[PDB]
Amino acid sequence: KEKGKPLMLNPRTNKGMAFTLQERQMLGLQGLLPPKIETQDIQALRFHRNLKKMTSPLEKYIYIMGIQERNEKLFYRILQDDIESLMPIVYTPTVGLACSQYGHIFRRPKGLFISISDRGHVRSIVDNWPENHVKAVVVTDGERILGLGDLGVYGMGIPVGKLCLYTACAGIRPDRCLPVCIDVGTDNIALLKDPFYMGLYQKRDRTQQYDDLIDEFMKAITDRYGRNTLIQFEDFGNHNAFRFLRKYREKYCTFNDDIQGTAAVALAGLLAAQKVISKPISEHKILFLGAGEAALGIANLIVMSMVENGLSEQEAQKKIWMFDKYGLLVKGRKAKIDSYQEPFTHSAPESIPDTFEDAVNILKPSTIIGVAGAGRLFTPDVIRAMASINERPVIFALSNPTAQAECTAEEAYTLTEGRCLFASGSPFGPVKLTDGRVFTPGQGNNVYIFPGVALAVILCNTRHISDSVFLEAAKALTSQLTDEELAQGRLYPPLANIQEVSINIAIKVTEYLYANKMAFRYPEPEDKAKYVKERTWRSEYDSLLPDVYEWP
Amino acid sequence: KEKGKPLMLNPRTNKGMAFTLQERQMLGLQGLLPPKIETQDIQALRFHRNLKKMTSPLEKYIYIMGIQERNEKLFYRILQDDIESLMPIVYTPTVGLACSQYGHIFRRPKGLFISISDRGHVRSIVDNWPENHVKAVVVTDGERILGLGDLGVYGMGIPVGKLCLYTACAGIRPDRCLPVCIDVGTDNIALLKDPFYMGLYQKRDRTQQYDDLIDEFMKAITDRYGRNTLIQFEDFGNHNAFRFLRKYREKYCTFNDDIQGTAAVALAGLLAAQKVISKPISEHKILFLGAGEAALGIANLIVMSMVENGLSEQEAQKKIWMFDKYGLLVKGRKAKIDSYQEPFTHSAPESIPDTFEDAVNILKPSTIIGVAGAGRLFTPDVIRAMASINERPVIFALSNPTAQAECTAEEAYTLTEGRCLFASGSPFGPVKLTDGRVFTPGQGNNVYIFPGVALAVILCNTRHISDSVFLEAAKALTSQLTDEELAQGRLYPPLANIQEVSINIAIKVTEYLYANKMAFRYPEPEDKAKYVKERTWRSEYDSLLPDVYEWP
Amino acid sequence: KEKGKPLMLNPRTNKGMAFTLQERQMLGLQGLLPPKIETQDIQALRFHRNLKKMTSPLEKYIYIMGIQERNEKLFYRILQDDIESLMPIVYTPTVGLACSQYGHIFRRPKGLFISISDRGHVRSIVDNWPENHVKAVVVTDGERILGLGDLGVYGMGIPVGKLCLYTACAGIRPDRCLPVCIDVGTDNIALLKDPFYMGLYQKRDRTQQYDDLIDEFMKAITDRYGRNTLIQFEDFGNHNAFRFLRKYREKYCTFNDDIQGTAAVALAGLLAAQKVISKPISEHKILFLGAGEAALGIANLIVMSMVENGLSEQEAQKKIWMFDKYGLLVKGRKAKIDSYQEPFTHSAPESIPDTFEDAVNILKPSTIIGVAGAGRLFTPDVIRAMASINERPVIFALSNPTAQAECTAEEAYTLTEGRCLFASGSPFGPVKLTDGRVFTPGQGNNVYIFPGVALAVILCNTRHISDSVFLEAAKALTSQLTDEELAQGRLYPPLANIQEVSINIAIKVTEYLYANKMAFRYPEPEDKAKYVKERTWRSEYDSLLPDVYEWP
Numbered sequence A, B, C: 001k002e003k004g005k006p007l008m009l010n011p012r013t014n015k016g017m018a019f020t021l022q023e024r025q026m027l028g029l030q031g032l033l034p035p036k037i038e039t040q041d042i043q044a045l046r047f048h049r050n051l052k053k054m055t056s057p058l059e060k061y062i063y064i065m066g067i068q069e070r071n072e073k074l075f076y077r078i079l080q081d082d083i084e085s086l087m088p089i090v091y092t093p094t095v096g097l098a099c100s101q102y103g104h105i106f107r108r109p110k111g112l113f114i115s116i117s118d119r120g121h122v123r124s125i126v127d128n129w130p131e132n133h134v135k136a137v138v139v140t141d142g143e144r145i146l147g148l149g150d151l152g153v154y155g156m157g158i159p160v161g162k163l164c165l166y167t168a169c170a171g172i173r174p175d176r177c178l179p180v181c182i183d184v185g186t187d188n189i190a191l192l193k194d195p196f197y198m199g200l201y202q203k204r205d206r207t208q209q210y211d212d213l214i215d216e217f218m219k220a221i222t223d224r225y226g227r228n229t230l231i232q233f234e235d236f237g238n239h240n241a242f243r244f245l246r247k248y249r250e251k252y253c254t255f256n257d258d259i260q261g262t263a264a265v266a267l268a269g270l271l272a273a274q275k276v277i278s279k280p281i282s283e284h285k286i287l288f289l290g291a292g293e294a295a296l297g298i299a300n301l302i303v304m305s306m307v308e309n310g311l312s313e314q315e316a317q318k319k320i321w322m323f324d325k326y327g328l329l330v331k332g333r334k335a336k337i338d339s340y341q342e343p344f345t346h347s348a349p350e351s352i353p354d355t356f357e358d359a360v361n362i363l364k365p366s367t368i369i370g371v372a373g374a375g376r377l378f379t380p381d382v383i384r385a386m387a388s389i390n391e392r393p394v395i396f397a398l399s400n401p402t403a404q405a406e407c408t409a410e411e412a413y414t415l416t417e418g419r420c421l422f423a424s425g426s427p428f429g430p431v432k433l434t435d436g437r438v439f440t441p442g443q444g445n446n447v448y449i450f451p452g453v454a455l456a457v458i459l460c461n462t463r464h465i466s467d468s469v470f471l472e473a474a475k476a477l478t479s480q481l482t483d484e485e486l487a488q489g490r491l492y493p494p495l496a497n498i499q500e501v502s503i504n505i506a507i508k509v510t511e512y513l514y515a516n517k518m519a520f521r522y523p524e525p526e527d528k529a530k531y532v533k534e535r536t537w538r539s540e541y542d543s544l545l546p547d548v549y550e551w552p
């Protein structure tokens, strides 16, 4: 709708020297750009050339995330060129590093910021966002950033990172994505004394005003963009996460990535592992390190899988144990146990375990899943214990970023002598044992799930997301694992093919949504695969020339 | 999103001197307006003062229609002050006069113009319309403008007038209405030699390209604004009208005002008359003057009403006869008889009537409906014949504008000595007979129907409009007629109450759409009346002040 | 700059159907305009066709002034088609009728409004004017609108009308003109009780705050647009008029149209008259009816002319007598005599005249100039006296509008039996005496002067305007009168050629400014005629196409 300099200041439209000569002359850009007409290919080459000379990951993050604020098309072409090598820079673990330093590297803001001080005026803030057709929102309050804790407004880096993957992985239109940070204070003492902090200088408001603010936010967002606007909750504290999920899942189109997204990718990993172990469903014993968002989400999904495979909900729940910061969850312990943990809180065993290692030796689980976000809790002894108890132990260290991981791939594969099936939330390179064998660990991170599910739900005009949708996504993800890849130690499809893998999950989920009368997009497409592929946003430059033609 | 002079140049936001002091200072308008702060009441007074001094209707039309291009809010405020006295100026009959001279009084364009020369680039035309969220489109090709014939692009005045009533009558938001004119040429020889003509100087293109163009238009409109965008076809030629309705009613949210809207108001009138005559359903005999869009639409709607009241479709259709420009529609006549007319084409009677008067004296109908758009065909003899055959004859002269009317109120009431029940498409004032009795004729014009139906369909996110919707609208209109008003000779609710009547029809229709699973707006409101009334656009000025508040 | 709808909403850019196909497609207007591509000629025809059907002058004024708010280019094309017939509608007398009813016919505001309530914030008001390169300002406080009196903010019509002539007559760019109204209240009791009044409801502020405001205005205007911005004072009360001229003429580029502009046109008329009377400079006796802005302005210019032709300043002033509302101006009268009148206030004659007729018989003047703004004071007896005293009496009735004129053309020509040389401020058509002789009276209105002077001053970058500039404009106007036109009774060039006349005056004035080291535009052009003609704004449409071209 506008010509001249503004077309170059808006990263959404700016093509740099790729604007053709005719576009420049017709749009008032001639003279404002160097004479040279470039191609996106030359621009990509300039980027990779500069990236090569850079040393630190944070330096690289600043550079490429900056490109998103300069030339959006080029930004995604850059990710698309090699998503695997750029993932650790734009996503975990470096995104965690960027958040902890957000106030120090700040240059331009990204996303919508809503604070408790704006209560009563949230709608006018939403009306300030430039884009008029938002379809996907990723929101956080920064209380549980990865396993890093409370980073307040510095946590806005997470939503922006997630939304980049929406587009890079599933082809969801960037102009229809909206990262949101809800600022109600922070209990991080270091930030409250940091002069570069970008949020309110107050402790977190935990009164009803907090709930009222979230309510106002959900209403404002949907009032402007539609009741079926996808709203993904990310990195909210344990308490708030479940209650907001329960409270809104039936009234809005929403899901929690740390409860349901992580649950689905974990399940996909276990299904892949079972494909190589073939353990009798009755001999499965799962022990969780932690009992929060991820543990409960994963546990509930594992149970649904066992139920649709014979076992009763009750018998399935008995195969799952949890161990949190206070110890094993057993009936009558002094430490609390909420409604969600009840189903997995069993009667105290022969002896009560003091450490996690004791829990492993006493319960003798076949699977160990780390989701405590508290560092190396899967000690060498915990790993050796699992190797002596099981022929093929399954060890999952899902906490992010790297430093918070329960253990590394190198430790898991070595201490088990290449007999375990390992998956981690953050990346670890291939591991070569002294005997020459090479193991390539998979990354059990929800990035394999949310892009594809988000794409399907949006295309199908789904109103509410049921848990079964994530079970279906879990299956669609694992069903893409080729046997040759399992052999190498991969419990998930190669990260290099995350684009195709995400589109395939969306296709499967879209078919599931229509089959179960959960899709409201009319008419129903006959071929779901063609339907999804035709609607994916591409990073190639579009022509900005007005339609000129002679009249007959 | 903009300030300064532009706020005054856009009729949508321009308040004139009604901009408060704070708005002017905060939006950069101080000094661009006189110091005086006015109210809308004062602005309305200025208008009525000036209107009073004007003489000709066309002069008045140019003035008030011009206000819509200067101050939209004030425009509707003015219509709302006295819709009854302004209706004949902004709508029939004057709008017909305006179209005839459109090129002579042209000042500023309104609506979108799509020509056959634009085939292949229609989407680019649709992208030029400034509004982003259109919900209703009224389109014409100007081939059958009222009973005036082919006026080509001069016919754009009709869609503009219709959309004014959408808002003034049913409170549909103006910024969500789009008047469109499809220009593929004109057969009007006078216009092709007129130097002020606003369209292509060529005969009408009646080849497949025309159909292709309309196809491209329907697709471009829905691609930008949504598949459930209400598309009202207005004043298309007979052949094109039915085939476009049949072709699109199942694939788009569309209806034809001349076939379905007129059918509904006509039926509402008959239902009211029956309430005064109480004639045995078996003794009903309806004779149509004309057998096109209106005749066929009305006939089909009368048949549905009879079937839902006992009679079978077969026997109901036998009570309906039609007489067109070639004479009585009888089986085997030399003049064509298409698919739609077949059900009402009977076996030749005892003697074949030559004139309409012969048809009346031979068939002895109890009801006569004029929809020939060809002038005074209901001659004094025709009327006298009806008064001698029926105690209380029903005479409807629905052709517009006034000069095309089959007869006047004065003629109908006088020649039947006040025994008839009369309704006309164009307005006629009260009639006083030599014996002192005063008769107030009703106006059977679709304006009583499309505003209310359009509102309901838009609010309910209806995907397709069935004919039963118009049957329900017909019933909702007639159920608002108070017995006291029927006595006056009113077959329709007072035009002065058009606003309230349209909202009531909308409520009834929305209740019908939900009850028959035709509404897709979720969640379903419990109280449909409160649902409709809360969403009607109002002509009162809104505050344009930015949201300023302190941070606690 | 802009693209799309905005181009059509701004009268400056809007071309209506004259936008070419390429222009529409490249500027995003395709579909927003009827398919027809028109020329300005066709638009001009539409206008004249509509104007013919109209009856009253006020109705015509509203219509054409409304065009300035829709299509500026077309507006001036229309004036140019026939400036002589539209002059009385856009200018005197109709413009006076319009201002007296400005609040009743208001539709859109024009110009900048500065009120006493904005004292201290005048600059921010000036910063709200959209145009960035203003070169001419016409300002009024509405206290002396024509001979109509105090009309307050209703007087804005005058600065708007004057600027129209800046462009229509001298080709001064419209976007570089700014009409301004200074509102400090009004003493007009009728307006203070009018609900449609557009100004502050308070009597005029005659305190130092008024002077402050005017001073703040001059500084604000010059600060944003430049010290050489031409500021034309128009219709200020007698007291303020002189004091502001004297106070600012040496610090800013300013002049008063009622004092200096009127003076130059009157002088030009006298010079023409002398060309047909050849009366010995010694026997010249001028009697003024009134002794304010115009009389003092004219008197001083006449004096300069006589001095430059022999007579000393002292003896030239002796040939000038003035008669105001209290009687003849004689030394020692009870009525005040200010500094400006002193030079023309002589010793009481043998008998002190009581009426103007008595003043004529006693002083026996050869020239009579009416500038009292008080109606028909040149009674039949006054005129008869002049014809009896002189063979070829010179009678000037310069007050406006028509009703305030001292006498009509018909009155002057008949009562003097065609022997007088007449000129009036308002227009009067040809007069035919009973003997068959036809006399065409000239219009001594400053419109023959300010357009040309204004153009010259602007083009020359003149800093201050001396009284001698007006003397040269007076000579420049008169030197264009052909002998044949003198014969007809014309003291001024035909109004129909006002465009060429203004351009010629501008050329003579720029040559004068350069010759007298008053022009600062560098370099100095060698051919002033080519310099002026090349820079006049034209009403023909310009191409809005972006520069598109192929590269080698």
Ligand SMILES: Nc1ncnc2c1ncn2[C@@H]1O[C@H](COP(=O)(O)OP(=O)(O)OP(=O)(O)O)[C@@H](O)[C@H]1O
Binding pocket: A135, A171, A172, A173, A176, A458, A459, A460, A461, A521, A535, A536, A537, B222, B223, B224, B225, B226, B227
């Ligand atoms: N690439 C995309 N990224 C985000 N949302 C998308 C994307 N592609 C399509 N959609 C959304 O998915 C929904 C269904 O898509 P579809 O194209 O069938 O609908 P549409 O109404 O024709 O499109 P639109 O409303 O965008 O013009 C729409 O609401 C649309 O906004």
Ligand SMILES: Nc1ncnc2c1ncn2[C@@H]1O[C@H](COP(=O)(O)OP(=O)(O)OP(=O)(O)O)[C@@H](O)[C@H]1O
Binding pocket: A144, A146, A147, A237, A238, A258, A289, A290, A291, A292, A293, A294, A295, A323, A324, A325, A326, A370, A371, A372, A373, A374, A377, A398, A399, A400
């Ligand atoms: N040192 C620890 N040893 C065992 N369990 C711990 C330890 N520290 C914390 N935990 C447990 O880890 C769980 C964290 O749950 P929470 O909902 O906060 O996050 P999460 O999303 O499940 O974890 P992740 O960091 O893997 O995303 C809690 O149940 C907590 O008791």
Ligand SMILES: Nc1ncnc2c1ncn2[C@@H]1O[C@H](COP(=O)(O)OP(=O)(O)OP(=O)(O)O)[C@@H](O)[C@H]1O
Binding pocket: A222, A223, A224, A225, A226, A227, B135, B171, B172, B173, B176, B458, B459, B460, B461, B521, B535, B536, B537
């Ligand atoms: N006054 C109106 N005129 C025209 N369309 C309307 C009007 N009011 C509401 N609508 C439309 O009716 C439909 C249902 O109304 P509702 O208010 O329930 O929807 P919404 O999604 O909350 O609104 P919106 O999409 O406008 O923000 C919407 O598509 C809306 O655009």
Ligand SMILES: Nc1ncnc2c1ncn2[C@@H]1O[C@H](COP(=O)(O)OP(=O)(O)OP(=O)(O)O)[C@@H](O)[C@H]1O
Binding pocket: B144, B146, B147, B237, B238, B258, B289, B290, B291, B292, B293, B294, B295, B323, B324, B325, B326, B370, B371, B372, B373, B374, B377, B398, B399, B400
């Ligand atoms: N002079 C006539 N006498 C009888 N019938 C006529 C006469 N002239 C035209 N007709 C008929 O009137 C009908 C007009 O139908 P068409 O579809 O063109 O318009 P309509 O919308 O039905 O009429 P209206 O002008 O009332 O809106 C045709 O069937 C035509 O044969």
Ligand SMILES: Nc1ncnc2c1ncn2[C@@H]1O[C@H](COP(=O)(O)OP(=O)(O)OP(=O)(O)O)[C@@H](O)[C@H]1O
Binding pocket: C144, C146, C147, C237, C238, C258, C289, C290, C291, C292, C293, C294, C295, C323, C324, C325, C326, C370, C371, C372, C373, C374, C377, C398, C399, C400
């Ligand atoms: N009734 C009257 N008879 C004679 N002189 C009058 C009469 N009424 C007013 N005057 C004089 O006319 C003069 C008006 O001067 P003022 O400065 O107000 O306006 P102006 O610009 O000179 O006049 P014009 O109306 O021609 O533009 C005053 O000198 C005043 O005394």
Ligand SMILES: Nc1ncnc2c1ncn2[C@@H]1O[C@H](COP(=O)(O)OP(=O)(O)OP(=O)(O)O)[C@@H](O)[C@H]1O
Binding pocket: C135, C171, C172, C173, C176, C458, C459, C460, C461, C521, C535, C536, C537
């Ligand atoms: N047609 C016009 N109407 C009003 N002002 C004009 C017009 N034409 C030229 N001017 C002004 O007259 C002055 C001298 O004219 P000239 O064209 O020599 O100047 P310039 O500095 O080259 O032009 P500019 O500053 O407009 O780019 C300038 O200040 C210019 O703004």
Ligand SMILES: O=C(O)/C=C/C(=O)O
Binding pocket: A015, A016, A017, A042, A043, A044, A046, A047, A066, A067, A070, A071, A074
């Ligand atoms: O190569 C380019 O045109 C852009 C580079 C950047 O934004 O860093």
Ligand SMILES: O=C(O)/C=C/C(=O)O
Binding pocket: A106, A107, A108
């Ligand atoms: O543009 C930058 O690098 C920083 C801006 C800021 O500190 O606000």
Ligand SMILES: O=C(O)/C=C/C(=O)O
Binding pocket: B015, B016, B017, B042, B043, B044, B046, B047, B067, B070, B071, B074, C106, C107, C108
């Ligand atoms: O009264 C007003 O402010 C506007 C009047 C108009 O646009 O005609």
Ligand SMILES: O=C(O)/C=C/C(=O)O
Binding pocket: B106, B107, B108, C015, C016, C017, C042, C043, C044, C046, C047, C066, C067, C070, C071, C074
């Ligand atoms: O003829 C035109 O295009 C414009 C006419 C007007 O603005 O009145």
Ligand SMILES: [Mn+2]
Binding pocket: A146, A234, A235, A257, A258
């Ligand atoms: Mn997370």
Ligand SMILES: [Mn+2]
Binding pocket: B146, B234, B235, B257, B258
């Ligand atoms: Mn119609």
Ligand SMILES: [Mn+2]
Binding pocket: C146, C234, C235, C257, C258
């Ligand atoms: Mn004046």
